[PDB]
Amino acid sequence: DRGVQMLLTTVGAFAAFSLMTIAVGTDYWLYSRGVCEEVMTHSGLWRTCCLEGNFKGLCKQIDTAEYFLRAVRASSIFPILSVILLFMGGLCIAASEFYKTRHNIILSAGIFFVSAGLSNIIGIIVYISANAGDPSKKKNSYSYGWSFYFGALSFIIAEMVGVLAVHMFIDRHKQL
Amino acid sequence: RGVQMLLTTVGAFAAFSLMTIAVGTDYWLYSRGVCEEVMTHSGLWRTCCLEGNFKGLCKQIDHTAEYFLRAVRASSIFPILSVILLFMGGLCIAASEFYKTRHNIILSAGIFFVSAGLSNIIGIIVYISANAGDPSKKNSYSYGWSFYFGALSFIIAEMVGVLAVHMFIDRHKQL
Amino acid sequence: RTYIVTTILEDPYVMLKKNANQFEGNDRYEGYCVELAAEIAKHVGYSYRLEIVSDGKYGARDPDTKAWNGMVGELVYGRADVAVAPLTITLVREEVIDFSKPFMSLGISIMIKKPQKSKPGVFSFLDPLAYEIWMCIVFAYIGVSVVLFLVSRFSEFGIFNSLWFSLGAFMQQGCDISPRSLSGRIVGGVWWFFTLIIISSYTANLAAFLTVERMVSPIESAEDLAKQTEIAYGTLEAGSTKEFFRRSKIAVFEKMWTYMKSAEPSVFVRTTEEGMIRVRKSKGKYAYLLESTMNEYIEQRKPCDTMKVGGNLDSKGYGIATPKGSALRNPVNLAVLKLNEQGLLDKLKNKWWYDKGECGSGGGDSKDKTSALSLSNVAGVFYILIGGLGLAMLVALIEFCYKSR
Amino acid sequence: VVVTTIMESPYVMYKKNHEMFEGNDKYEGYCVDLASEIAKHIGIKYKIAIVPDGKYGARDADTKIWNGMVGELVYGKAEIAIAPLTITLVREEVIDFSKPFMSLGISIMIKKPQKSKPGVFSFLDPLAYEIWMCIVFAYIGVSVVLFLVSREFGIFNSLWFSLGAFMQQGCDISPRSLSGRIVGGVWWFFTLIIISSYTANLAAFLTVERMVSPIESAEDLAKQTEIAYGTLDSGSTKEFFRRSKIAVYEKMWTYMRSAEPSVFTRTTAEGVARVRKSKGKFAFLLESTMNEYTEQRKPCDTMKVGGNLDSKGYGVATPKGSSLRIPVNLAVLKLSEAGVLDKLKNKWWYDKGECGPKDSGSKDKTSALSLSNVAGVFYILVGGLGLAMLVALIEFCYK
Amino acid sequence: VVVTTIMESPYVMYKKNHEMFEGNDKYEGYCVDLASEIAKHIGIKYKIAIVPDGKYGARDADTKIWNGMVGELVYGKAEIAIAPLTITLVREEVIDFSKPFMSLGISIMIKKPQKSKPGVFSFLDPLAYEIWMCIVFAYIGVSVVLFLVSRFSPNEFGIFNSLWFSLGAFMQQGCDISPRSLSGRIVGGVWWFFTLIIISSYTANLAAFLTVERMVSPIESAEDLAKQTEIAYGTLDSGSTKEFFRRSKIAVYEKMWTYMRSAEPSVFTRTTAEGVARVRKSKGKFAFLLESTMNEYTEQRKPCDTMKVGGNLDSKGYGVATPKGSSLRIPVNLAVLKLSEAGVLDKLKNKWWYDKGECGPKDSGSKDKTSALSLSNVAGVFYILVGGLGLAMLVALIEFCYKS
Amino acid sequence: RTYIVTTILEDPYVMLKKNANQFEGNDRYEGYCVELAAEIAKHVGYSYRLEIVSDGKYGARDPDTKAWNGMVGELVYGRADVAVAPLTITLVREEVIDFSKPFMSLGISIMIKKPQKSKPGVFSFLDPLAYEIWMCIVFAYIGVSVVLFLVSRFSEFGIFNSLWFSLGAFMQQGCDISPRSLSGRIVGGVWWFFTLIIISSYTANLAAFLTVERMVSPIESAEDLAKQTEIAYGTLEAGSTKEFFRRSKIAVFEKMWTYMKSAEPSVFVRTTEEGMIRVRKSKGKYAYLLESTMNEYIEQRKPCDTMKVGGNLDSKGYGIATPKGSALRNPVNLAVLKLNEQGLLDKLKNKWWYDKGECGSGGGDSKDKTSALSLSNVAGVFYILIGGLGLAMLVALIEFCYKSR
Ligand SMILES: O=c1[nH]c2cc(C(F)(F)F)c(N3CCOCC3)cc2n(CP(=O)(O)O)c1=O
Ligand SMILES: O=c1[nH]c2cc(C(F)(F)F)c(N3CCOCC3)cc2n(CP(=O)(O)O)c1=O
Ligand SMILES: O=c1[nH]c2cc(C(F)(F)F)c(N3CCOCC3)cc2n(CP(=O)(O)O)c1=O
């Protein structure tokens, strides 16, 4: 009983890739009561825009132990690293499903899934420490949007594939 | 292993001497009570005053769970059971020193020491709850070396009991 | 000869009968002063025929063009001899007419919105430590579990074993499982430190939350009301309360008089009902500084949201009005004194102020004041716990399937 | 004008400088200041005098004379009585009374409420009884369900596992089932959260140490409370309690009649000395004026008013056929309306006090934890150890 | 009798918009009530005439004309002038000055802080500073000594095993193998006692720090303000404060003047309104320095975010003016002194200064805010967790590289 | 011609010559006042001859039965030129002479003893418990250890092993040894319940102590002193402070005057130094309101145990007395105003009041309140730690000595 397991890992990693695409391309992250004044905004990691207000239609981009993380929040650099090594993980599992002889390719694959999990957590915590880390922010707040839960879903399916693909390593290593 | 039996002998006699000096003589606590701020010598039957305008007279002192603890603190029934219980314990230590063959009396004596230590420490806490859990109104909790004799009646009784058990986990091997 | 009585109806004195106009008139009157009038007419002997008030107002001195109005105005200007309806005592009334005796001792009172609050269930469980931190610490726990499996089986220690060790490590219970590789020991130690600080932070926050929640005290008296600025208070412009506040010279009274003298919001209201419904709409910070009897009357009303606090700030009194030189001045004084000392006045007050009230029949409904964590705060845990047990039972049966199907 | 006054505590007093002046300027208090204020209001030359009889003023009802102030006013010895006099039915047909310048009534008075020093209740003062019987029921249920779901955990091994988890410890043997993992994790989490809740509650309670008013806080609670209640032998309180129509005061009368005969006390000094010796004993239902007097004297321990009962009136006496009756009536009414007698009452009853802690609350040092709050711990410790030794002895006898 | 004042000051105010209380008495405020009181004292007619110069007054030596009220007095259009007027030499030698009715000083001003939300320092906030490296020093010492105990006795504990056992003891969860040595009992129990007392102390200290807040101000004195050199300071472009700073003599003021000499972010503000708006916009720098009266006035203005730290840098005062000696001069001097010694003047001053401001009505602080711990008080712990986990994977990777 | 200047022998403002005899004449006095006199004499231009008033008192213009004295009396009697001296501006001395300019500001300010509490070492360790409590914990430990050994050997266990497990069970620390049999199981259960409840109680108590230590209100201004009602405050029988208290008009100032006039502890002061000694000997239970110049003088030249707090409660100025009809009136006013605006007067004040002061409050850095701990209450912790460490090492070596013997 392993073929259905490779199928599950493939569909989980493709789901993670699709979640990365819907997280980067679109801006359904949080349902913030911003100014467009408290009104719903679609503020992205790459693209912040509004839906109501007097200027709806035009929108632009976002931007000794605190400058580094502010630079991260401005540049979104750990989410970029996460999606980059997630694409690398997709490429290497495509190679593994094409080349079944090699063994360390899935070692690399496992380290990309776990580093994707860690980088996604680092990005979401710096995002929420720049989101809930401002004491000024505001009668209505919280109530995070659907792509915040999609990033949480990306983490939980990353944990699922980091269970099952690491189990591929375990049973292939005892096979080895 | 005669060192262990002589340790039991000296511990039992020292315990008897210290309990006699502790409960038989009013020497328990130092205080600034009224007989004014005067030191008092309170025991079980008779409390002595040492200064003040009442100098020279030593006065006989009287006295769901609150009634039980008040009766325990007044009548000192747990100290009374402790001293009677360890008197029986000392009797069977004398018997074991004489009769080196009976087994139940000396193991039972081990239970008598541990139960008497428990009874003495709970008598200490109940009398210090009659004094501190019933504060009336610094140096009030002063032990005039007879509460330290009760502390010895706990700790060196624990020592003699544990070395008796060390002799008893070896007496189980002996028999 | 016959005699007449004049009355004024606001609350709850000259209430009309529930049968409307099918009765004979003055006998259709249920209240305090009407029963008092009937009893005091039976005491000495005279007719208690009710007289309709001309304007419905109690009347004042009216310094413009002199004269008088109300019950006292009818009494001075003929065709009125007995006034049973209660009215306060002041200088201008004594300057013209005289009273017999006060039949209660009242004063100005302070009222506040009744504190109504309901403790939640599972929401009080996640109260002191937010909502997002729980979700992301569950995420951190499951991530540490899977990466602990990786580091333990990369250098026993299955995914179930790693989940068990991480579950026992997340909240300090201990286990017989222990890592061997130095990386496993390092990650276990980092996890232990993190969750130790998390539990300490939760305990500190919960202790602080109860301390600040029970530290606050209910408002009472006058000096605490004066020192309190976030609770607000005021009075009506057209009333004797404003005149009493302005004419007072005592330091505390002048202090809060200066306080609401500079009233920037719309503090002052027109009628008692308007201020009462404004209190109900606000329910967090407002006051009216209304009378004691009116406060006790509003306290016993069906919406059941007003209560009396503090005491009487002054010593005002009621009375019944009689003219000068009449033959019914001394006997009515003896009658009202006899009723005061007999206790029948207290019986009538208890009957028409406590017994017939549709609210607060059992006034002592909440007086235990149990300042301890009851089964209304953490019992939601007892839900999810047994719910987890229920889930355990569910997973039991399915793993029973795993050993039976 | 000459006025006679009884030697009573809150109205007149013999000054410490007795040789300073003999006559008018020899008394300081509520009564003389009120008399001076009304004399300045109307305009008269006023003096002060003491009653030669010493009685407060009442009718003996057999000699057809009154014993006191009203007796000497009717029989022609004084023309005004600024000393206070409660208004009753008998003193209206022979004397005249003005509007009440002060309101008084029968009010309760209890001893000082202090922090309790319980033995077993101190162990369980945080949380409640209900939550702890619920937790022991949950403990039994969890232990039996984790015993049955494993069928190495037998009927004592499962109990020991649950017991070790219940005070935040570990165990030697851990199960391998997923249901066992779920139940162990949820029980551990519940144990940790309830210990955190308990320690937060205990910390808040110990850092606030806030006192709560006793059960005797209302008339119905006084009737439902087993604490004793005493009052004077005879007087206004006894006359009011003799005849009632409320049917709760009848219950109080029956309680007094069926209780011990010690509830009757001769003097108020003896009564306060009696109630001072204990926190419970017999509490009083006495005059509000004397209650306000006693709450702001040198021993500031009993300072409780509680609820208010009854309604009376303090008035100024005036002989019949006197032209100054209307004058003194309008004077006292103008005083009580405009406000200087209320100011005088404040300055002499609340401002004039030996202790100021009653007006504004203060804090106290937490000090050491002592042993009153901890002796219950060692009591349950010795109870557990004694039960363990008893079951060990009976197990030795058993096998 | 003509008297003058300035509308550009917190001493007069227009009644309603227009045509309200027509006649002479139109404006209400501190100075006009002071004038009314002294007029009731001595007896004089009132006026509301205002000089259209706008500027309060200066010594224009080139033109030899004084501007505003001082020129309107010295060249002659009135006899009494009550207004905020500082007293210096050039205005004294032409017009005499009476005793000042209220003390004056120049003080610094900083914006109101809102909260402190650090990262690792938030975890580092409770329980001293030196304790952490004291703790790690104690940990290293106890670990090496207990390893010496286990190795010198002739056991199943290496340096890593001893380190992990000591940490598991420190973290209050347990371990795998007890040392089981009669020597090791004392050291194990003592280190257990240490870690339990330190976790209890940490929890209680965090509870005490969280249950209340006191919020110590960043600055408390002008000397410390000069010493810290982390918050930008700017007086004004020109005026009395700039003239005093340019010609001071006390030792720290020369260093302050050299500090304003190297002025990068244009600390010479053109107007006081622009300066207070800028310091209200940003609280990290650009702290202001102005007179005490305007500071206490801004303390009672609508934003409600401004305080003073105490301490007066200079000493001046406002006094009344009168052209030359006459019958009115000694009269107004004695009236001003009679009102100054009596308690009416400071009653009127503090009453009218403290009723018009709703900001200071809530004195001290408000305790009706419990909130909850957001991530900002916890993100240091989350960050050290994720850093430790990343470092654990880093050391696992380099261990894989070293061993295989 | 020559001019005479009169100077009052006042403690903060003038010194008697310590060298005295060998340098007499003009250089008999050193202080702020004589330095200001020399400076204004150099500015205006004249010669100064020092004089001392006969009565040694400031004096006043009270309408008594003649016998006028003081500095204003010396000026008005004609035997004076200019009175360069401290002089409070007031009405009684304004009607006969005029004062020049206020060069310093006076305000009555409260002083308070400096609160210095030394945090102990091992004494602060067991501070949030009782010595009783700790001795019962130790004895319960040893008794439960010995009875656990008894029940383990009664129902595989050594006394060392029983000590290990009893330490771990009391200590909330895990171990690999378990209490076999149900009697040992229930002993262990009672033991963990006991130690958990004691640790919870101790943590709660120390948290309560830290909370009540942090939640304290230091005295600031006059309102806090008015509403604290714990520290007694009083002033001299006569003087400017008493006159201000009698003529107080502010509501809070009238309140504190009434509180002082209650006179339960009375003024309890005769001279300034007597009150200073009393308030230093009162251990912070007394308070004194005095002129801020004396307060700054005591803050530095007196030993550093009394300190200033709060601002000036009133604004009163200084001046130098000048004759009403002399030619030395206007130039000296111009000179003193020029020195006030220049800052050299402030330079002289700072030089005489900050440099030659025997205290280190303003000449050195203070203590920064960073809250939290300060390695003081936890020093005994690591102390007993390293003591147990050394004891364990030495008992290991006596065990090895047993091995070698
Ligand atoms: O004799 C008088 N007795 C009064 C009795 C009452 C009431 F309490 F309702 F019984 C009131 N209410 C006060 C609250 O708002 C509704 C009217 C007014 C009275 N007034 C007129 P005031 O001048 O407004 O006090 C009198 O003159
Ligand atoms: O009308 C009456 N009013 C009374 C009012 C008071 C007081 F409380 F002082 F106001 C008192 N005090 C009771 C306590 O001892 C001192 C006198 C007695 C009164 N009595 C006498 P009784 O007949 O014993 O009640 C009356 O008759
Ligand atoms: O006599 C004088 N009295 C002054 C009084 C005030 C103040 F009281 F604060 F209103 C001010 N403010 C300075 C800050 O902006 C608002 C006006 C300026 C004054 N100036 C001009 P400077 O020379 O620029 O001080 C004088 O000359």
Author numbering:
A (entry chain F): 5 to 40, 55 to 81, 93 to 166, 170 to 208
B (entry chain H): 6 to 40, 55 to 82, 93 to 166, 171 to 208
C (entry chain A), F (entry chain C): 389 to 543, 566 to 815
D (entry chain D): 397 to 547, 572 to 819
E (entry chain B): 397 to 550, 571 to 820
Recite the paper's sentences.
AMPA-type ionotropic glutamate receptors (AMPARs) are integral to fast excitatory synaptic transmission and have vital roles in synaptic plasticity, motor coordination, learning and memory. AMPARs are tetrameric assemblies composed of subunits GluA1 to GluA4 and exhibit a modular architecture comprising three layers: the extracellular N-terminal domain (ATD), the extracellular ligand-binding domain (LBD) and the transmembrane domain (TMD). Here, to determine the subunit composition, physiological architecture and gating mechanisms of CP-AMPARs, we visualize these receptors, immunoaffinity purified from rat cerebella, and resolve their structures using cryo-electron microscopy (cryo-EM). Our results indicate that the predominant assembly consists of GluA1 and GluA4 subunits, with the GluA4 subunit occupying the B and D positions, and auxiliary subunits, including transmembrane AMPAR regulatory proteins (TARPs) located at the B′ and D′ positions, and cornichon homologues (CNIHs) or TARPs located at the A′ and C′ positions.
To elucidate the architecture and subunit arrangement of CP-AMPARs, we characterized the structure of cerebellar GluA1-containing CP-AMPARs in the presence of MPQX, a competitive antagonist that stabilizes receptors in a resting, non-desensitized state. Additionally, particles in class 1 with the subunits at the B and D positions were untagged by a scFv or Fab domain and thus are GluA4, in accordance with the biochemistry results. We categorize class 1 as A1A4A1A4 receptors, using a previously defined nomenclature. Another class displayed four auxiliary subunits at the A′, B′, C′ and D′ positions, but weaker density for four transmembrane helices at the A′ and C′ positions without extracellular domain features, thus suggesting that within this class there is a mixture of TARPs and CNIHs at A′ and C′ positions. However, owing to a limited number of particles, we cannot further classify this group. In these complexes, TARPs are consistently found in the B′ and D′ positions, whereas there is greater auxiliary subunit heterogeneity at the A′ and C′ positions, similar to our native CP-AMPAR structures. We infer that TARPs preferentially occupy B′ and D′ positions because these sites provide ample space for its extracellular domain, which promotes stronger interactions with receptors than CNIHs.
